[PDB]
Amino acid sequence: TYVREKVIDFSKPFMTLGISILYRKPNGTNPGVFSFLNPLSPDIWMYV
């Protein structure tokens, strides 16, 4: 960084880089019969 240049000296920039993000894949899934209830109350699903 420039501040770190302002205070001491490093070698030349030899292993160059640039900031980037890390995050889950995440493989987030919940398929199956246990999904379809959602648009309506599971109790109300029974009253029907």
Partner: peptide, 22 residues
Amino acid sequence: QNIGGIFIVLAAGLVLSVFVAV
């Protein structure tokens, strides 16, 4: 228990269903 307000408006027919008996 949100829209049960209509499982209960439902009753108006099951109440009305009595009359044609005579």
